Amino acid sequence: KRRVVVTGLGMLSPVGNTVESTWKALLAGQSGISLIDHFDTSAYATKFAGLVKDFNCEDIISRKEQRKMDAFIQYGIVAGVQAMQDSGLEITEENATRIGAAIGSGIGGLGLIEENHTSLMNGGPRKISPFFVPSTIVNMVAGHLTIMYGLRGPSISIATACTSGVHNIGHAARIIAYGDADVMVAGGAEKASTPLGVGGFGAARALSTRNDNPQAASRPWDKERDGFVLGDGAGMLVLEEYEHAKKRGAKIYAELVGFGMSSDAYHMTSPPENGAGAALAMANALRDAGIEASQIGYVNAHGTSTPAGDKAEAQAVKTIFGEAASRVLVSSTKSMTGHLLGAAGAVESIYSILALRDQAVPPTINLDNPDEGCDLDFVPHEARQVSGMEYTLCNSFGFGGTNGSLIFKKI
Amino acid sequence: KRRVVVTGLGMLSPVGNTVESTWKALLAGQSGISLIDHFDTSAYATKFAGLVKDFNCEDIISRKEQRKMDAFIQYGIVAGVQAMQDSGLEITEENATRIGAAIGSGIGGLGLIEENHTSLMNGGPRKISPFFVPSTIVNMVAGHLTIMYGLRGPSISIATACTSGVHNIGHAARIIAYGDADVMVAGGAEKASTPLGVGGFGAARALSTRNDNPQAASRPWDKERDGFVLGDGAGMLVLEEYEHAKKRGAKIYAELVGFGMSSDAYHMTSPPENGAGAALAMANALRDAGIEASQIGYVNAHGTSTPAGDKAEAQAVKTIFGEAASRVLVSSTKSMTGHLLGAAGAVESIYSILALRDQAVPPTINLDNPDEGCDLDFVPHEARQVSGMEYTLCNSFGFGGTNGSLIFKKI
Numbered sequence: 001k002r003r004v005v006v007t008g009l010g011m012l013s014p015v016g017n018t019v020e021s022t023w024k025a026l027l028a029g030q031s032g033i034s035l036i037d038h039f040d041t042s043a044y045a046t047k048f049a050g051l052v053k054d055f056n057c058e059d060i061i062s063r064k065e066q067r068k069m070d071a072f073i074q075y076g077i078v079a080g081v082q083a084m085q086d087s088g089l090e091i092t093e094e095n096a097t098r099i100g101a102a103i104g105s106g107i108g109g110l111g112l113i114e115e116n117h118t119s120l121m122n123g124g125p126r127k128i129s130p131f132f133v134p135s136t137i138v139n140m141v142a143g144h145l146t147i148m149y150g151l152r153g154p155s156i157s158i159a160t161a162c163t164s165g166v167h168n169i170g171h172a173a174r175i176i177a178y179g180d181a182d183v184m185v186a187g188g189a190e191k192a193s194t195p196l197g198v199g200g201f202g203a204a205r206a207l208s209t210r211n212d213n214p215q216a217a218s219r220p221w222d223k224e225r226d227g228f229v230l231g232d233g234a235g236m237l238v239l240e241e242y243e244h245a246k247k248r249g250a251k252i253y254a255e256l257v258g259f260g261m262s263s264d265a266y267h268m269t270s271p272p273e274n275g276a277g278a279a280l281a282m283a284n285a286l287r288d289a290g291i292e293a294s295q296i297g298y299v300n301a302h303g304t305s306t307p308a309g310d311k312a313e314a315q316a317v318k319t320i321f322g323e324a325a326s327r328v329l330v331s332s333t334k335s336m337t338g339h340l341l342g343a344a345g346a347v348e349s350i351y352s353i354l355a356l357r358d359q360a361v362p363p364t365i366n367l368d369n370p371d372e373g374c375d376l377d378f379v380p381h382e383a384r385q386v387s388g389m390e391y392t393l394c395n396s397f398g399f400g401g402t403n404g405s406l407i408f409k410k411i
Numbered sequence: 412k413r414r415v416v417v418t419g420l421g422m423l424s425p426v427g428n429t430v431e432s433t434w435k436a437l438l439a440g441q442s443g444i445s446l447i448d449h450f451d452t453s454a455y456a457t458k459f460a461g462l463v464k465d466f467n468c469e470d471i472i473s474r475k476e477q478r479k480m481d482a483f484i485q486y487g488i489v490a491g492v493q494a495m496q497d498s499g500l501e502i503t504e505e506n507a508t509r510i511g512a513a514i515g516s517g518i519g520g521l522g523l524i525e526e527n528h529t530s531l532m533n534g535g536p537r538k539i540s541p542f543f544v545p546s547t548i549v550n551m552v553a554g555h556l557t558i559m560y561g562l563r564g565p566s567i568s569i570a571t572a573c574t575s576g577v578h579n580i581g582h583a584a585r586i587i588a589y590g591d592a593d594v595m596v597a598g599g600a601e602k603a604s605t606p607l608g609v610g611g612f613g614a615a616r617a618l619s620t621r622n623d624n625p626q627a628a629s630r631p632w633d634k635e636r637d638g639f640v641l642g643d644g645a646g647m648l649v650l651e652e653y654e655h656a657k658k659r660g661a662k663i664y665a666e667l668v669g670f671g672m673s674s675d676a677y678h679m680t681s682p683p684e685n686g687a688g689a690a691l692a693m694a695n696a697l698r699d700a701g702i703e704a705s706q707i708g709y710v711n712a713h714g715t716s717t718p719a720g721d722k723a724e725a726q727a728v729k730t731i732f733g734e735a736a737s738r739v740l741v742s743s744t745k746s747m748t749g750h751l752l753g754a755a756g757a758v759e760s761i762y763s764i765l766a767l768r769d770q771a772v773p774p775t776i777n778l779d780n781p782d783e784g785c786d787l788d789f790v791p792h793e794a795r796q797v798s799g800m801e802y803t804l805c806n807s808f809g810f811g812g813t814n815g816s817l818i819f820k821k822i
Contacts, residue, residue, distance in 0.1 A: 043535045068679075097691065100674060104570070107548060117528045117607060124454045125610035132611035134679045134810065137518060138549070138570040143811025146674040152691065154672035155813040156578055159515070159549040159570040167567055174585060180672060180695070196528060199536035200543035261565035261591060263511060263557040268479075268545045280508065280563065284591070399545065400554025402566040 004173040005411065007250040008087025008238030009350050010079040010187075014050030014231050014337050019082070022347075023354050026362040027383040031215035031336050033229060039195055046207040048214035049193040050231030050338030068131040069140070070109030075234040075343075076141030076189030077148070083185060084149060087238040088250055091149050098182040100153030101142040102172035103189065103236070104164040106342030106398075109136030110194045141189050153181040162302070162398030164188045165235065165345025166406055170259035172239050182244045187346035189234035201230065204269065208305065219366035220303035220332040221310050221374050228304040231338025235346030237353075254353045257391075257409045260285025264401030270308050271397060275316030278302075281403035282320045282393065289391075289407045294324040296407070297389030298361050300352045302397040303332025304339050313397065314374055329386070331379035335365045345396040349406055352392040356410040359386045415584040416822065418661040419498025419649030420761050421490040421598075425461030425642050425748050430493070433758075434765050437773040438794040442626035442747050444640060450606055457618040459625035460604040461642030461749030479542040480551070481520030486645040486754075487552030487600030488559070494596060495560060498649040499661055502560050509593040511564030512553040513583035514600065514647070515575040517753030517809075520547030521605045552600050564592040573713070573809030575599045576646065576756025577817055581670035583650050593655045598757035600645035612641065615680065619716065630777035631714035631743040632721050632785050639715040642749025646757030648764075665764045668802075668820045671696025675812030681719050682808060686727030689713075692814035693731045693804065700802075700818045705735040707818070708800030709772050711763045713808040714743025715750050724808065725785055740797070742790035746776045756807040760817055763803040767821040770797045 009019045014032025016022030025032070032050045041047040057066070057078050066074065080103070091099065112135045119127040134140055139157035146155055154175050158167040165188035172186035201207045208227040210217035218229035245252060262284060264277035271277065286293060302313055318325050333351055340347055355361055361384045370378070394406045420430045425443025427433030436443070443461045452458040468477070468489050477485065491514070502510065523546045530538040545551055550568035557566055565586050569578040576599035583597035612618045619638040621628035629640035656663060673695060675688035682688065697704060713724055729736050744762055751758055766772055772795045781789070805817045 043537070045536075096676070097673075100672070107544075113524060113607070114528060116611070117525060118532070120606060120610060121529070121532065125456075125606070125613060126454070128607070128610045128614040130614045130616070132607070132614055133518075134615075137572060137810070139572055139809075139811045139813060140679065142674075143679055143813065146676045146812060147679070150676045152674050152676050152688065155571070155674040155811070156582070156672070157570050157813075159568050160566070161548060161550055171567070171582065174589065178585065178589075195531060195536070196524070196539070196543070199531060199539045200527070202536060203539040203541045203543055204545075205541070261511070261567070262508075263553075263563050263566040265507070265557045265561045265563050268551065268554055268558070277563065398550075399548070400550045400566070401557060402550060402554065402568075 002177045003242035004176045004239050004256045005242050005245055006237050006253040006353055007240050007245050008083040010082025010086060011235040011347055011350060012052050012075050012079050013233040013347055014052060019350060026333055026336055027360055029363055029365045029382060033214045033338055035214060044198055045202050045209050046198055047211050051193060052232050069135050070112040071191040072105055072109055072189045073141050073144060075191055076103060077144055079234040079236040080145045080185055083236040083238050089183060096150050096152040098153050099151045100155050100181045100184055101145055101151060102156050102168045102184055102186040103142040104158040104168045104342055105138045105189050106159060106161045106164050107192045108138040110192055110197050112136050114194060114196055145185060160398055160402045161400060162341055162344055163396040163402045163404045164342035166396040166404035169349055170404060170406055173256045173259060176239055176241055183240040185236060186239055187236035188343040190340050190342040191232045192341055193230055193232050216366050218305045218335045218338055220305040220335055220364055221371055221378055222367050223369045223371055225305050225307050225310060228306055229338040231340045233340045233347060234343045235350050252411055254356055255409045255411050258285040258289030258407030260288055260405040262403040266401055269399055271312040273312055275312035277401055277403045278313055278316035278397050279319045281405045285405040285407050291391060293321040296328060296391045296393050297386055298355055299328060299330040299393040300348045301330050301332045302395045303334055311371060317376060325376055329361050329379050329384060330376055331362055331364045333362050349394050352394040352408055355392055356389060356408060359389060361386055413588045414653035415587045415650050415667045416653050416656055417648050417664040417764055418651050418656050419494040421493025421497060422646040422758055422761060423463050423486050423490050424644040424758055425463060430761060437744055437747055438771055440774055440776045440793060444625045444749055446625060455609055456613050456620050457609055458622050462604060463643050480546050481523040482602040483516055483520055483600045484552050484555060486602055487514060488555055490645040490647040491556045491596055494647040494649050500594060507561050507563040509564050510562045511566050511592045511595055512556055512562060513567050513579045513595055513597040514553040515569040515579045515753055516549045516600050517570060517572045517575050518603045519549040521603055521608050523547050525605060525607055556596060571809055571813045572811060573752055573755055574807040574813045574815045575753035577807040577815035580760055581815060581817055584667045584670060587650055587652055594651040596647060597650055598647035599754040601751050601753040602643045603752055604641055604643050627777050629716045629746045629749055631716040631746055631775055632782055632789055633778050634780045634782055636716050636718050636721060639717055640749040642751045644751045644758060645754045646761050663822055665767055666820045666822050669696040669700030669818030671699055671816040673814040677812055680810055682723040684723055686723035688812055688814045689724055689727035689808050690730045692816045696816040696818050702802060704732040707739060707802045707804050708797055709766055710739060710741040710804040711759045712741050712743045713806045714745055722782060728787060736787055740772050740790050740795060741787055742773055742775045744773050760805050763805040763819055766803055767800060767819060770800060772797055
């Protein structure tokens with residue numbers, strides 16, 4: 001039996017370029033949602049998003065090297081470098097073989113696929129950049145980090161839309177627990193705030209259209225919800241075996257103790273009003289950790305601010321916690337940050353971990369009027385203070401009906 | 412300890428629309444490589460590919476429903492339906508929860524991303540199909556199958572370029588062995604023979620340019636190699652726990668006994684001349700199965716027909732098998748089929764399984780002149796007959812330096 005702990009955190013988000021700055025902004029209820037300015041949004045129904053602000057990677061990645069990678073990969077590396085540095089791991093020739101990565105993305109290099117397609121349309125195939133493939137495909141964030149640090153252990157990339165971050169982190173732990181690796185860098189990165197990204201989700205009418213007030217648009221569980229808000233970023237954690245980490249004396253942030261997965265088998269984009277698949281994934285993670293629902297203080301919800309989705313999750317928490325439903329705190333940090341698709345599960349695992357360290361729970365800002373069949377404590381406007389919280393649950397219920405939940409324990 | 416066996420096979424490939432027809436074409440050395448005719452290839456350096464011929468899914472998927480999915484998803488479902496049917500699995504309300512999927516793709520819905528981008532360029536965002544996202548993203552093959560059969564178990568999608576098929580199959584087995592599922596549909600699907608796909612790989616100069624003779628272009632380990640050949644398709648297998656399958660009395664094709672993963676930590680597209688990462692993945696799968704290299708009769712090689720790549724793999728087989736090197740049969744079925752990227756590991760696992768059933772090894776067609784530092788038996792022109800083969804090794808070494816190997820055992 002091999003235990004997995006978190007020894008390093010890193011991230012880029014709409015409210016901060018580091019872990020701690022991002023953390024502090026969330027506890028103060030700061031929004032990261034701004035108006036889009038890098039492309040003309042005149043014809044667009046949604047003109048805002050959670051954008052990464054003032055991004056600099058010149059020190060980490062050269063300008064020469066920057067040309068071979070879409071922004072999602074650039075975000076992924078920077079956040080990856082932060083997690084490696086935070087962890088305090090020396091990579092030696094005798095170590096390489098046991099350290100790998102499990103980093104994903106939901107859509108991957110959309111920005112660069114558009115550019116190259118535009119080139120092709122106006123110039124033919126000779127104008128297609130020679131780095132087309134390696135700059136856009138999903139597994140290149142893990143490809144780049146492995147080379148950079150000489151990681152010769154297992155390397156995977158899970159692409160499950162909104163559940164990517166949670167699936168990657170959990171399978172990195174399964175890998176570690178199986179014996180295939182000792183350390184894993186895990187997480188997700190996304191940068192889908194492009195014409196095709198805004199338009200595409202816009203075309204399905206899944207996005208909020210509240211352009212008059214961009215920062216109040218993302219309002220999970222509020223009555224005026226009109227769709228999710230798109231966000232960019234990347235979260236990354238260092239996962240490693242307990243005895244390996246203790247032996248070197250690493251910063252141990254927490255322990256990954258449960259991982260649950262499920263499918264809805266219902267609709268390609270919409271969830272069951274029941275919340276049946278969401279319940280199952282929470283149920284499975286609970287069983288996987290061997291704890292009851294009343295031992296979980298805080299649930300970082302999927303909470304995307306969609307009419308149908310917010311109700312289902314609510315209903316699924318009632319079904320699992322039951323009498324502890326009113327006793328458990330459930331908040332959506334997507335009210336400040338927006339939905340980071342493939343990085344959503346990664347950044348939100350960090351929030352769930354940090355909540356255990358500081359005994360503070362981030363709020364669901366903008367919750368002015370709970371939905372009619374809503375009854376739980378959604379940590380409504382300001383951060384709540386807690387005292388003896390040992391477990392947290394992080395939920396991701398994504399497109400295609402693929403669900404996941406992670407359970408963390410304070411050590 | 413839970414053993415995983417293969418109880419159902421399904422696939423669409425360039426040499427056949429079914430498993431058996433594909434199998435028979437490979438043993439006869441038939442090529443599936445044709446000239447591209449669905450787009451103007453006048454300016455293109457590569458004008459050929461392994462295309463799926465005479466595809467019909469009207470019986471499986473309606474024309475109404477066909478509009479919401481890229482060709483890769485359409486291929487994935489058809490092959491998935493074949494595997495479900497082949498397996499003989501009844502999905503009941505008491506079963507749903509234990510059956511899931513692990514289906515990936517390397518590039519996903521390229522065809523539909525181009526169409527939608529073209530629409531956007533000529534029409535603005537209102538012309539973007541409302542099914543943009545769900546028709547292109549990688550996890551939608553597993554999304555569609557889960558809904559179709561009511562699979563409520565774990566649902567993941569691994570996207571590791573050329574290793575996708577092998578990573579998905581192996582993690583489906585890890586899931587099964589852990590206890591999260593009893594049955595898993597696993598595999599990959601790809602359809603990257605599009606303007607951006609041919610052009611993009613063309614732009615990196617990774618593709619063969621032998622337009623005078625399309626069927627002799629793919630020639631792994633031959634001296635005249637000038638790049639890999641692109642192919643479309645999808646392979647799918649039903650993986651399930653031994654005792655579950657025996658209890659219902661299923662067709663047991665073989666047992667998944669080993670799974671190895673590694674990274675090269677060298678270059679984003681090129682492998683180490685050494686073959687170091689490839690050796691490690693074979694080494695790890697061997698250790699995972701607990702057998703030595705001399706117990707493996709046949710190795711389905713990665714063998715893409717690239718100068719650099721073919722030498723590295725050769726060198727990696729020498730390092731692992733050593734004195735059994737000349738005793739072991741290694742062939743590349745990509746000489747007939749081409750490189751199916753994310754489906755390559757899935758279709759080639761089936762070939763490795765079928766080889767055990769029929770004691771016949773498919774050839775590496777077109778091998779007229781082995782490379783100078785080549786010395787192994789590459790099953791050169793015609794299928795070889797074998798007698799007491801119990802183990803086979805299937806290799807996938809992909810872009811980003813992500814490697815994998817699967818080991819199968821005859822039962």
